[PDB]
Amino acid sequence: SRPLWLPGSTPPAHLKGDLPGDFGFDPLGLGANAESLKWFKESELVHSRWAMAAVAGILVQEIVRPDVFWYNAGKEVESPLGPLGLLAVEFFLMHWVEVRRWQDLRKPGSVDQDPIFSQYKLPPHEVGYPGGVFAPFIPGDLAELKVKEIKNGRLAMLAFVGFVMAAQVTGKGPIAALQEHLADPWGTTIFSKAAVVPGQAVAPPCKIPASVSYKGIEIPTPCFLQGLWP
């Protein structure tokens, strides 16, 4: 039937294949509950879209501005709009849009009306896929496009995790670390930096310092779960 993550596996009973991207991977049974599955579905959608934009941004950044480091690109911008005014505008606008999305989650058909201008509203849609002003120019079918979206999004989530850990253990960017891997495949993999043996543990050092100043304070910038590193 449908392509599963394990070709010979029987999928969990709650995973019947109705969702976009239901490749039968719920070994812990987190989506066994019908009500929490919807929240986890929306969470996957927004994690997917955030990670896709994030990976595209890091890639484009390391293309067109390679002198800056994306792990360091918070303290190497120095906008004139202040470090606090940035946080203020983003906090308020994101609180707005995210509470609107949350009210879409709680009450599905509730928040479609443009509050300021009374004549625009979104059509009745699904939970997680607004459409309307969000979605002009759909190039093809909707279910296949949702499948493609969630697949590229899962790949982008794993890609951002790889970005983070490779920026931590190497201190280089994604494309820079890729050029390092292509410059020495057998000698720059995580297997070639680390090894734990019953008697010896070799964890790679992270090139990210423990703290960065950023204007008179000490921002703690720790490597993710060092110590648990191999």
């Binding site: 004139p80 709009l81 202040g82 606090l84 005014g85 940035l86 946080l87 203020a88 009210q103 709680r106 009450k107 509730s110 928040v111 009306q113 509050p115």
Partner: protein, 210 residues
Amino acid sequence: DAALPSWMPGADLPGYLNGTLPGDFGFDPLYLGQDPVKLKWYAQAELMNARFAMLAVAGILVPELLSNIGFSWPGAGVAWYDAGKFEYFAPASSLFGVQMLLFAWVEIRRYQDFVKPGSANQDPIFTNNKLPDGNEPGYPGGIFDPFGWSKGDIKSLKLKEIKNGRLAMLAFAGFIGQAYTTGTTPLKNLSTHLADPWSTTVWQNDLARL
């Protein structure tokens, strides 16, 4: 629940806020006005705090507006929180005395119309002078509407009243907060925010203050 505008589109509106009160947006997350008599008081309390806050913030801004324009008053330029230390023809003692006496008259009049509508629509002295019947507690009418409003458009006018009133209540609360925080006049605070809006936010000022 109805199709009235809400404070949170999609929220579970409580129900006892049915729209009969001006400014009904279903905002009762504490469920304070659940009792009917409690709400009958709270409506007039909101209206009185609202009108007093509108008068208040007018007396906050306008003095400093005519100061920063450069008009001529002996009490010009002085702040609102330094207007108690100002000196006048009389000390503030007799001013509080006369103020409380006149207000003990008129507020008890208002209260006697509140506990029984239709009571105080007539003068002690001039029986011929009267307020017309059919007016609600809180909206006296008659000589309180001498320029010919409130014939129609009364629902939206009450909505406007309560909206500007809640806005001025928040304005005066902010005046307290900024007079205890920034130490300057509120319009100078507005000008300071209009000078450097991005590094004179409340987070920046609070963090530089500590």
